[model samples]
Target: SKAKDLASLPEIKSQGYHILFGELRDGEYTEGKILVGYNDRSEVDKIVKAVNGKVVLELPQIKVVSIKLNGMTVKQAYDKIKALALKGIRYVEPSYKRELIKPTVVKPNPDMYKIRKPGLNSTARDYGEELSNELWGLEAIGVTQQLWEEASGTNIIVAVVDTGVDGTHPDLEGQVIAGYRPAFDEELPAGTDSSYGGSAGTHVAGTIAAKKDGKGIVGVAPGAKIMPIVIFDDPALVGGNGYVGDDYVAAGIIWATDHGAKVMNHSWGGWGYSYTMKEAFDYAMEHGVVMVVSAGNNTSDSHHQYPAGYPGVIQVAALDYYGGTFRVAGFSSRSDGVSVGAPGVTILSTVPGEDSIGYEGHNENVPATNGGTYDYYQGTSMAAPHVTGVVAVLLQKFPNAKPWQIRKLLENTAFDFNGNGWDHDTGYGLVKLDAALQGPLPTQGGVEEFQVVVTDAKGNFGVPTVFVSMMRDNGSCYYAKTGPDGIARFPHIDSGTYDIFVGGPDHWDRALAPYDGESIPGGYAIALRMAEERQASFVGFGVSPDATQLNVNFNSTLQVKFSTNLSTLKDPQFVVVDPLLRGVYGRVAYARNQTYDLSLLSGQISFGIQTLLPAATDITIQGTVTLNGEDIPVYGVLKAGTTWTIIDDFGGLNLGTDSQPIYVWWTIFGQ
Candidate 1:
C-alpha cells in the first residue's frame, strides 16, 4: 500500500489528478493553483495558455473531462486545480496504481419435464407449460405468476461473466451478442477451445433467459438479451485455467457494465478479497449495473468471498430440495451478506453444443453435444442466475428502480419456509417474485403517492363539484372532481413533473381561480378560491411607524417619495379589475383582503387617461389603491379624443407592444 502511494506521487508525467468528470481544453496546461471559472471557457483557457495543457476527451454522458499534461510545473497544475475548487468544481480525483486476485465451482443432476408447449397458431396456452416441473426454481420463487409476456426482459442486457458461451447452440443460437475475453485480450475460441468453459458458461446464461420455443426449457426472464463474457478458460481445450485474478474479474465487470449490461451474473467466486475488485463493483453500482454472484462451493462461511462479500453485490446460496422440502444445500455457504435463496439442486438448463457435456466452438470433426439437450447442475453458481433473471424482469417493468429498492422488495416479499424471518442460510427466506411484484414498490421507493384538496378562492373550505386535473409534461393525464367541502384527491402515480389545471382538457374554460396546490404523500391536494374572490393582495404589511423606506425602491425623488428599489410587480393585483370582463361597465373591483403598497398606496402617477383600462375586458372602477388607514382615489376616465395607442402584454395576457396603438390619452393625477 505504501509503495502504491509512492508510485502515485504526482510529479510531471509521473503524476496527475484523476478528475472524476473533467474536461481539458488546449494550452500550456499550466499548473494554475486553482480553477478560476466555470462555463466560461476563457478562464480555463488562460491557465492552459500559461502552463501548456490540453483537454483530452469530453465525456458528456458521465460528464468527465480527461486532461493531458503538455509541459507544466507542479505549481502550475496545483494552481489550475485550486482555481477549479474556488469555482465550485466537485468531481476531481488523483491518479492511483490500482490492482486483483479466483473461481468457485460445484456440480453434481436430472429431472423430468411435465409441461408441454402449445403448437403454432394456438390461441390459448398454459402460463408455464414447457418446463412446468423441470423448472422448479421458477415455481419455487413464484416466477410463473409473472408471465414473461407482460414483463419479459424484452431488451434488457444480462451479462454472464464466466468462461465461454456456445452462442451457436440451437436453443442458444440467437441469444449471444458481442462476447469478450478481457484477459488474453482476444475473442472467444481464443483460449476457449474446451468443454467445461463453454459448457458451464452457456448453462448459466440459459438459466437466465433461454428461449421458450416449444422444444427448449424456458428461463426466468425469457425475453432478456444475453452477453457472454469469457473471463476464465480451461486448458485441455485451448488454454489451461491459469491463475485467475480478481483484476480480470473486475475488468469483466466493468467491460460488461460499459456495454450496457444492466444485470450481470457472476456464477464464479473464490480466493480472498481484492480492493480493486471492490472498486470495480462500486463502478457498476454507480453505473446502475446489478450483479449477482455465487457464494462459492467450499462449504465454508461465505462472509469472506470477493464480489459476493463486496458491498452492493447480491450473493446467492444454493438450496437443496432432496427432502421434498427446501433445505440449505450441504455446500451452500452461510453469510450475513447472503440476501436470499433459490432452487439449485438438480436444476436443469440448456447445455452448450447439443448434449449433456457439450462444446460449441470445437473446430475438430466433433459435433457440439452428443448427450441430450439439457444438463443438470448444482451450486450457488446456478442459484445466482435465478435472482439475476428475476431482477431483469423486474427492471423490464420498473427501469427506474434503484438497487436498494429492488433488494427491499425481494427480501421482504420472500417466503419464510421454517417461519424464520431471516437467517444466514436463507436470507429473508427464499425470494418470492409474485409477492414482491404485487407489493407497493417496497415502501414507496418505486412508485409514489399524492393527496389533493379543493376549496374556495377565499381560503374557505368545502367547495364541491370543482374539477381538478393534471397533465404530465410527458402528456399522460388524470383528473378528478371535488365533492362537498371542495376536496379533490389524486392517489399514487408516476411523473417527472406536470401541470395542474381546473378543467377538462376537452373543454376550454379556465379555472377562474384563486388556486394553489401541490401533490403529496397519499395524494395531491388542490385548493380553489372563488373567481369572485380574485382579489390582489400584499405579502408585506403592518408598519408600526411607517418607517422611512430603506430607499429599497428606485428613483430617489419625492414624486410620491420615489424609491429606485420599488417593486415592479406585487403578488396580488390588490384590486385587479378582472381582465376577463373586457368592455364591461359599472364593475367595482373589490376584495375583503386589504393590500398595502408603499409605493402606490398613498402615491400618485402623472399618467394618461384611463383610455387603456376604462374599456378593458373586465374594467373595474379606478378604485383607490391604499393601506389599512389610507386610500387615494385614482381615476382619469374621460371621453375618448386625441388618443394614444398602447400595445403590450401583461404577465401572459396581451396588452401593449402594438405598432398601431389603441386610443389612450396622457394626463396627470394628484397625490
Candidate 2:
C-alpha cells in the first residue's frame, strides 16, 4: 500500500490533474469512463444520449452515473457533459485511480523483548488460546479486560472497506457477515476467505474484531462483527498491481451504509477530491454511520486527502509506541482534519490463513494452529482500525449515540500525550478506550470556537488588520479583526456551515475565503492577496506551452484599469522550475485591457485559456496612480517571458524563491 505509488494505468497528460509538491502534475484515470452527477434522475437518460455513453453504473442514491464512453474519448465526453451542466448537472469529472495507502512493515528488532501471554500453559496443543506479546497497541491505547467487560460491540457491524477480508481466518471465524465488492458487483460469501489482494482489509478487520476465545490476538472490541466491503480490484483479475477507482469506493460507502454497518473503517486514501465520492460520504453521514478514515501516510499535511478531509468524519493519525512511551509516527500526516491518534507502528495483526499468500509488510509469519497467521504492519492504515474498534465498543454501549456524539466523546477522553490542546499533528491525542468508557457524555451546546490564520498570498506573510467575518448559512454574522500574527478568533460559534469572508486595507476586495460556505471549526487557514487597486499597471505570465493560458495575481497590483499595447518580439526559451525541479515551459501572451478581462488563475498551476492574445509580443503598461492626493505616473517594460505587477504606490520589490518570476514589492510613492 505505498500511498504515493501511481497505479499501473496509462497517464492522461491533458485531462488528468493532481497537485503534488505545490505543482499540478499529470495523473491517471480509467480510460473511456467519466462520472457524472445530476440533480434530476430523469436527466440520466438524456445525458447518456447527449454524450453517446453507455451506462456502466448508476448510484441513484447520490444521483451519480458512471458513463462508459461508447464512440467518444473521455475528454470529449467530459466536455459535452460539462456543456450540459447548466441544466442541473452537479459535477462532471474523471474516475480517478489510486493505490492502497501502504504502511511500513519491518521485522522486529532482535533486542526488543517479546511479551507472550502471561499464565497460558506453555505446552498447550491449542495455540488459539495463546495471546501474543506483540499486542502492544491495545496496551498503548489503554485497552483492558475491564473495558471489554463493560461493552464488546456485540451486534454492531464494522465495515472494513479496503482490498478484501479473510473471514475464514481462525481469529475471525463467525465474526464476519456477508458483504460486497463494488469493483466486481459481487456479494462476498460468509464464513470464507475472499480474494487475496492487499492484506490491509484482513489486518484492519482483525484489529476491529478478532475472536476473544483466548485467541492468539484479541481486538479492542472483540464482539463487533466485520462487514467486508472490497474496493480494490483483484490483482489476479487485473493481471498486475490492483488499483482503486473512486466510483467503486463511492459504491462501497453506499453499500456499507445501507447494510446496517454502524462503523466503517477506511484505511486507505489518496489526494484526489471526488465530488461523487463526497456525496456518497454525506449520504452515509446522514444515515448515522461512523466513518473513520486514515489521515494518510505521506507525512505531509493532508489538506487534499478526500473523505478524511470531508467535514464531520473521524480522521485518525498514526502513533508509534517506544519503550513504555508513545510518539506521533514521523510518517503520519499532520493535518487539520485529524481527530485522534492510534498505535500504528510495529503492530501485530491477523493475515490471510493460506501459507503461500502474503500481504504488504509481511515479515515473519507466526507458527500457526487452526491455520491462523499473524504479521506486523505499521502505517496510518493500522492506526485507523484501532479507533474504529473503539468506536464500535462505544456504539454497543450507547446504541442510539449519534456520530457527532461519539466523535466528541472520543476527542474529549483521548489522552493528550503530546500536550497543549488539539494539534494538527497527533490530533486530540491517543485514542484511550479505558478513558472513553469512563468519560461522561458531551453536553449539548458545548463551547464552539472557530479560528483562522490569514496570510498574504505572495509569500505566506502574515496579513495584519484583516477583517474576518463568519456568517452562518441560516442567520447570525460574527466579525473579528486579525491580530499582528494574522490570527482571527471567534470564541463563540454554533456548529453548522459558515460562509467566511475577509476584507481590510491591504485586502480591500471583499472576497470569500477558499473554504467559504463549508462546515466550520476546521480548514481556517486562508491566504489573501492584496487588493487590486483601480489604477495600476499589470503584466501576465503564460503557463501553457502554446501561450494560451495565463497564471496571474502572484505579484503586486494586477487589477487596475488601463489599455496596454503589445510589441512584436522574438521567442525566449524561459523555463520555470519548481522545488521538485520539474520544468514548466513558458511562452508569453499579452492582451489589451479592453480586449482581455485578465482573469486570475491565482494559486493553482493550471488554467484555461481566457481569450488568447498575440504570442511573442512585448507588453507595455501605461497608467497613472494618485498617491497621497498627488498624481504619479507609472511605466514599466515587460519582457515576453517575464511578467510583473506594479503596485499603485510600491517602492520596493522582491522575487519569490522559485524559478517563477513572482515579484513582491510594496512602498509608499509620492511621499
Candidate 3:
C-alpha cells in the first residue's frame, strides 16, 4: 500500500469520472489513463465504455492505454467502470507518475585553471584525460592501459536515459547512435534551449563514452557509442527543478531495451517506485541489456528509492569524494541495494558546448574560463557512469556476458572492509577496472590479504598504525600490523567467511565477525574507520560550543565537548530538530521518507555528521547512526567526567536556530 501514493496520481482525482488504478497483476488493465498488459484494441474500446469514455491513445509496448473518461473522478469512474470493465480487469486503483529530481554542486581543484574551457583556448592534462598519468580512477580501475585501443569499448551501444544529448559537442563527435529517441512521442517543449537539455544528463553521457577526440576530453569507454533518450519532454517538467515524468521514463526504458542499447544509464532516482518502471527494467534485464542506476547522492538508505532500490538493477554509490583517499562519499546513498562504489568526487567530464565559454570547468577558478566542451561534476550520479562505462567496455570484451555476469566481475573485484561479504558504505569497496577485467577467479581456495586502515572522525583524520588480525572458520588465528592503503597490509588467509579484530585509537576496538573472505583474489580488501572521538564545534556567535561537527560552507568548525562517549555514540545519528527556517531550504526534500540520500555530514571520510551549512540556517542534530550490518558503526569513544545522557523527546536536546546546547563528556584527549 505504501508503494503507491495517491498524490502521485492527481490526473485521476481532478477528473469527473474519478477513476484510479494501480498494483494490478499481469494481463489486466486498471483504468484512469489506465495501464494494461493485454492486447485487443476492440477490448480496449469496450473497457472504456464503463467510464463513459473511449481509448484516446495506446502504448502497446508497455501495454497501456490512456482513456478520456468524460473527465473521470474517482467516485464516478469507479461506480460506473467497476462493473463495465470487470471482464478484463486485474486490480484497479489510481493512476500515477513520478517526478524527476535535480542534483548538487561540486568543489573543484585549483590546477585545472590553466586549461581553457570551450569557445576556444586553454588546454592541459587532467585525471580524466586519456594519456595523462593523473587519470587515477581509470588507471586505478584498469580501463586505460597502453593498448587501451583494443579495449576501446567499440561497437557497444550504451543508452543515456535522462536529459537530451549534445550530439554537436566535440567529445560526443559521431558516436551518438542515430534515431536514438525511439520512445520520445514528442520533442522537448518550446521556449526551452539545448542549454537546459539536462546538462546533468549530458555530463553523465560524457563520463560513459565521450569520444576520444584530439581536441576534447575522453570517457571511461571512449570507444563505445551512446544513445541518448530524453525523459523530460513537456514544458512544465523541463522548466527548473530537475524532475522527470513517469510516463516518459517508462517509455524510455522500454524503447531503449527494444532498440540496440546494450547498456542503459539512469543517473537519477527516488521519484517514487512503480510496477510500470520495474516491468520495463525487468524486460530490459531479460533482453540481455544491462541497467545501471545512481544509488543517489543523499547520505541515506537507498532501499526506499526506485530503479536503484528495485531488485536486479545495478545500483551504484559514490566513493572517493574530492580526491580524498577512496572512501564512501558522505552524500552517497548507503543501502543493501547499492552494488558498488566508484569515483564520484570532483569528476572531470564534458559539458554541452564547444562555442559557449562557461565556468563548466572548476579549478583555480569557480567559473574557470576557456569555454571548452569539458567540465567537472560530482555525485552518485557521476559514480554510476563510471560503472556503466566499465560495463560498456566489458560488453565489448566479454561480448556475450549477461547483465548479472557483468556485475559479478564488479562486485568480486571491489575492496571490502570488516571482511563481511558486503557492507553499506562503499559496498564491496570502490569498483576497480583491472580487477573486474581480471576474469573471475576459482570459486574455492587461496590465501588473500585483508587490509584495514585507521583514520579520523572529521571526514579528515590520521593514523600511524593499527593492530589488525583475522580468524579462520575453525578459529585459527593470524596477526599483523596493518597500514592498508598500499602501505602495510594484514596477514594473508583463505577465502569464504572470516572473523576480524583490530585495535587502534585507544578506546576503540573493532571486532567484525563472519565477514566474507572473497574479493579480487590476490587483490587487497581495504577497510577504514574513525580512530577516536574528534570534536568539531560549529564556530559562530550563539553557536553551540559542544557541537560535534561543522555543517559545511556557512557554518564554522563545530568544536565538540562530549559529556559521555558511550559505545552507542559509535552509531552517530544526525537528526534535524525543528529548525529555524532559512526560508529557502524550507521543509527540505531529502532522503529518508524511504527515498533520496541526505546526510547531516557531507564528507566522504567523516565518521561524525560532516555536512554543509546553508545560509541563515538553524537547527540541532541528534541520532544513533546505524549501518545495516551488525558490526557497522562498530566504533566508540572514551567517556570521562559526569557526562549527561538524554534519550527520548527533546528534554536534553536544544537545536534551536540560534544558541543550542550540546553537553558532552571530555574524559580523554584525542589525536
Please list the C-alpha lDDT of all candidates, in the order they appear. Answer: 0.47, 0.59, 0.48
Ranking 2 against 3 by TM-score, winner: 2
User: 1 or 2: which has the higher lDDT?
Assistant: 2
Tens-place lDDT per residue, model 3, 515-573, is 64422110001112232222221212111113211121111121222222233323323
Q: Write model 1 residue lDDT over 1-671, tens digit each, in one string.
A: 01111112222210111112212222212232222212334445544554466654333222223344566543345434432312222233222111101222333223221223212123222344354445667767776534665787878998888766766655565566775665554554322222335566777777887776655567788788788776655545333343234444555666778889998888655433333444566577678777777765655433335556554566777776643457777577766667778777667676665442335422222122322256666777778888888888888887887665676667778777757677778777777766776755554422222333433222333333345554432212344443333344432232234455543111111232325653211001111112111111212211111221110111111111111111211211121111111121111222323332333211111222122222322222233423222333434222233121111111122111122111111111111
Better of 2 and 3 by lDDT: 2
The CA-based lDDT of model 3 is what?
Answer: 0.48
lDDT of 2 by residue, 364-406 (tens): 4564355577788888999999999999999988877767678
What local lDDT score does residue 523 receive in model 1, on the 0 to 100 scale?
7
lDDT of 2 at 255: 88
Point out the higher-scoring one by lDDT: 1 or 3.
Answer: 3
TM-score of each: 0.47, 0.63, 0.54
Model 2: weakest 10-residue lDDT segment is: 15-24
- Top candidate (lDDT): 2
- Which candidate order results from sorting by lDDT in descending order? 2, 3, 1
